[PDB]
Amino acid sequence: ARIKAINTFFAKN
Amino acid sequence: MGGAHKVRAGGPGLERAEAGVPAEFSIWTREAGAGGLAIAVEGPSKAEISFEDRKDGSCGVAYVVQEPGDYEVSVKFNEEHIPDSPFVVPVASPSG
């Protein structure tokens, strides 16, 4: 079945 | 809204991948500047997603799926698809 994996990061300036 | 339109992404992991093998691609946020990068992999098995904050100003992403199949890889900048996201990525069984 369908898995959706989300990961978040903050690309810095 | 629309910061994401200035963000670009490329590399072998947005083109083809092999099951169980890390797939790497790059994201260059020069123009849009800093912000929130959310990556999604959607497919028949769960991805493990890692980031690499490079000194070059680019961000690295590697992901691993274990089951061959057709995955969609999304790259959002501040919650909005960047151009050509979703990327459709075929993951094949490994060679060798």
- Hey, is the C-beta of B69 within 8 angstroms of any chain A C-beta? no
- Using a CB-CB cut-off of 8 Å, the residues of chain A touching B41 are 4-5
The yes or no reply on domain B3-92 and CATH 2.60.40.10 is yes
* β-bridge pairing B48-53 and B87-92: unpaired
**Closest alpha carbon to B82 in B16, B15, B36, B23:** B36
User: Experimental technique used?
Assistant: X-ray
Q: In chain A, whose CA is at the least distance from the CA of B66?
A: A3
Whether A1 and B41 lie within 8 Å, measured CB to CB: no
Tokens read off for B81: 């698809």
Alpha-carbon dihedral sign for residues B10, B20, B36, B70: positive
Query: Resolution in A for the shown PDB structure?
Result: 2.5
